[PDB]
């Protein structure tokens, strides 16, 4: 198996079948078998918020080239409550209400996979029952196109794509933060700035990353 | 008389296990003054986990 840092062998505990398992645990935090399935969900969740976050940053940025007046991802928080029309408290506290429902629901299917779709949440049996893997609910709502139902050999082949596209969305979304704190400008602005004058726009020239 | 492994309460006035449960490791069939030998999970001051008693003192529960 094509491990990272070729020439070594994977940590002996995880050689197993996990989508996108390259044998990378250099601090050995999967050593607890009970805890590993908790990290596998932890990644899957971050990978899914990443891939939504990245597009959510780039598109309003890319939208701004043609005009169309959007903000950058930073200071899009202000611009909305600048124009407001609903208070900040009501919004953040509707978050915690609706959002906390899903997560605290998402959790007790991880704890005990049987419940959450036994029934008696507005019916909806088998939509929430979960398909048995850690971070994959499946079902009617979460899976409207009925994918991950037919051929499994094609499914396991998506589960790999999802992670590998997720691990990249995270590692890019670390760039959006870091290259904002330095250049103080949007992600697609930088993607033009370096594509225009690559030589003087590079990382060493932001005056922050390379202090003197 | 009393039998091995069965729990016991000890009424011996001078003791660290007085009124404290213990398990007989062995009982002798003999005329020994202090035949029965108990064993306690607790530790004495001396570090002693076992002692011999008389039949008149040991009582089984």
């Amino acid at each position: 198996r094509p491990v990272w840092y070729p020439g070594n062998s994977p940590p002996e505990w995880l050689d197993g079948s996990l989508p996108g398992d390259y044998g990378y645990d250099p601090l050995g935090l999967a050593s607890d078998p009970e805890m590993l399935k908790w990290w596998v969900q932890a990644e899957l969740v971050h990978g899914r918020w990443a891939m939504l976050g990245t597009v959510g940053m780039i598109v309003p940025g890319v939208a701004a080239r043609a005009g169309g007046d959007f903000p950058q991802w930073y200071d899009a928080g202000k611009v909305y409550i600048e124009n407001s029309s609903i208070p900040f408290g009501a919004l953040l506290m509707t978050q915690v209400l609706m959002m906390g429902w899903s997560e605290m629901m998402r959790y007790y299917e991880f704890v005990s996979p049987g419940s959450q779709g036994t029934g008696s949440f507005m019916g909806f049996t088998e939509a929430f029952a979960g398909t048995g893997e850690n971070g994959y609910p499946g079902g009617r709502f979460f899976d409207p196109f009925g994918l991950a139902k037919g051929d499994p050999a094609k499914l396991q082949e998506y589960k790999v794509k999802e992670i590998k596209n997720g691990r990249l969305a995270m590692f890019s979304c670390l760039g959006y933060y870091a290259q904002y704190a330095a250049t103080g400008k949007g992600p697609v602005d930088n993607w033009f700035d370096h594509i225009a004058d690559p030589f003087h726009n590079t990382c060493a020239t932001n005056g922050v990353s390379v202090p003197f | 008389g009393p039998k091995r492994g069965s729990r016991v309460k000890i009424l011996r006035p001078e003791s660290y296990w007085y009124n404290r449960a213990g398990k007989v490791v062995s009982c002798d069939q003999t005329g020994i003054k202090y035949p029965v030998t108990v064993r306690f999970e607790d530790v004495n001051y001396a570090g002693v986990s076992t002692n011999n008693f008389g039949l008149q003192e040991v009582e089984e529960l």
């Binding site: - | 309460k9 006035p13 660290y16 296990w17 007085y18 009124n19 404290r20 449960a21």
Partner: protein, 163 residues
């Protein structure tokens, strides 16, 4: 009023006591031009200190001759004459603070008692079992009465004595 005292708001030495501190403080911060944080840090404390004075005067504490707020123990005095917040209320707070950790220490010793060797279980805590007790300990007043009346709180007469 009570016990030959006066509410600190209508006190006098208390008002000296408040306004003598700011003077000694401000005469100190005249040594720092406002471009220094020490000019700000001292300022912020003078405004911080005056807040508490308007708080102590308002809340109705009783300052004796010295101008320092005293307290009053007796319920029949604190309650009837209106200020019980000195002890009478927080003496309830503490007991629920202290008994909670008190009774949460008893269950853990029970839960960890029956085992092969409880000793190693006292050194090395299993935090989940300790968490289930920290949770279960709440409402100990109602759970103490019940171990009290059911007879499960005491260990009765198999205790050991000497002579």
């Amino acid at each position: 009023d009570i016990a030959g005292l006066t509410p600190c708001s209508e006190s006098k030495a208390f008002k000296r006591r408040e306004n003598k501190e700011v003077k000694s403080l401000q005469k100190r911060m005249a040594k720092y031009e406002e471009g220094s944080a020490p000019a700000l840090a001292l300022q912020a404390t003078a405004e911080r200190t005056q807040k508490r004075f308007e708080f102590y005067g308002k809340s109705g504490l009783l300052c004796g001759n010295d101008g320092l707020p005293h307290l009053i123990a007796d319920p029949g005095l604190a309650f009837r004459y209106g200020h019980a917040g000195d002890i009478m209320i927080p003496t309830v707070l503490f007991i629920y603070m202290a008994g909670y950790t008190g009774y949460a220490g008893r269950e853990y010793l029970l839960a960890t008692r029956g085992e092969k060797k409880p000793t190693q279980k006292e050194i090395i805590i299993d935090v989940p079992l300790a968490l289930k007790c920290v949770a279960g300990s709440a409402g100990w007043p109602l759970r103490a009465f019940n171990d009290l009346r059911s007879g499960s709180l005491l260990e009765k007469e198999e205790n050991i004595t000497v002579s």
